[PDB]
Amino acid sequence: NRGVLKVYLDYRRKNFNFLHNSTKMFLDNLERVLIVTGFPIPPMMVAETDGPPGALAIYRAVEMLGGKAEILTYSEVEKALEPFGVSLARTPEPEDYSLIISVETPGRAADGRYYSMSALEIKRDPLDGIFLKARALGIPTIGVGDGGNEIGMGKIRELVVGHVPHGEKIASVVETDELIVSAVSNWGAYGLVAQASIEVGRNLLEGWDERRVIEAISSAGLIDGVSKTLAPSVDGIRLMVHEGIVELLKAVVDEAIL
Ligand SMILES: [Zn+2]
Ligand SMILES: [Zn+2]
Ligand SMILES: [Zn+2]
Ligand SMILES: [Zn+2]
Ligand SMILES: [Zn+2]
Ligand SMILES: [Zn+2]
Ligand SMILES: [Zn+2]
């Protein structure tokens, strides 16, 4: 994925400490964190496999830190997250929250319409708006994305339009106070947890079973964004790599803590 890798370069370059600032924000607003995930995929419009895992990892982290969390997603994701007994948001309001994080959620475009990486208009109720309001209310917001059309990429629309195919049409306009860019959004999410762990002195990703979570949500019906099929994978990449990255993170964390 040349495009996003260039965007990361451009971004990290001038926003060198973005993951760190993001993690400070996280660690300072755990009272009541709202986690939004779920990215429908045209044409079937079924929620993708990338996103819910990160959302879960963060959720488990907020609790381990003595905070409360709720997830706001689509039907299918709720179904797939059930086995993990996650607290769902019932008719959420910006004001009710301490922090609102987004892991791979469609972000409104300059059109005012939603688009897939292939530029197919996403047609489903958006989970977009609460972030706009949260912005106006000055409520702490964190967005994690890996393609330029997600919630929070509004902060670097220029980079997106400048390197990502279909940029002008696809790039989201929605901004977030802090933004994590990654090759795969769940990874960025694991980065947040990883960085937070280091700052706190405990490995919050300790028992994360990447394979067990992806196979799980996959069985429930969450598809793979690229193959658009029911494969135990994420963004067209097999578990082997995803496991390799989660193992590395866990390692970097123990290296700092101990
Ligand atoms: Zn550039
Ligand atoms: Zn209320
Ligand atoms: Zn194309
Ligand atoms: Zn994405
Ligand atoms: Zn992705
Ligand atoms: Zn620090
Ligand atoms: Zn995807």
Author numbering: 12 to 269
From the manuscript:
Here, we show that the surface of proteins can be charged with zinc ions and that the anomalous signals from these zinc ions can be used for structure determination of proteins. In conclusion, we demonstrated that protein crystals grown in the presence of zinc ions or soaked in a zinc-containing solution are easily charged with multiple zinc ions on the protein surface and that they are suitable for zinc SAD/MAD phasing. Considering the high phasing effectiveness and multiple zinc-binding sites, we believe that zinc derivatization of the protein surface is a largely unnoticed but promising method for phase determination of protein crystals.
Recently, we obtained crystals of TON_0340 in a precipitant solution containing zinc acetate. The TON_0340 crystals, which contained six molecules per asymmetric unit, belonged to the tetragonal space group P43212, with unit-cell parameters a = b = 107.44, c = 355.03 Å. Additionally, three zinc ions bound to a cluster of six acidic residues were located in a putative active-site cleft.
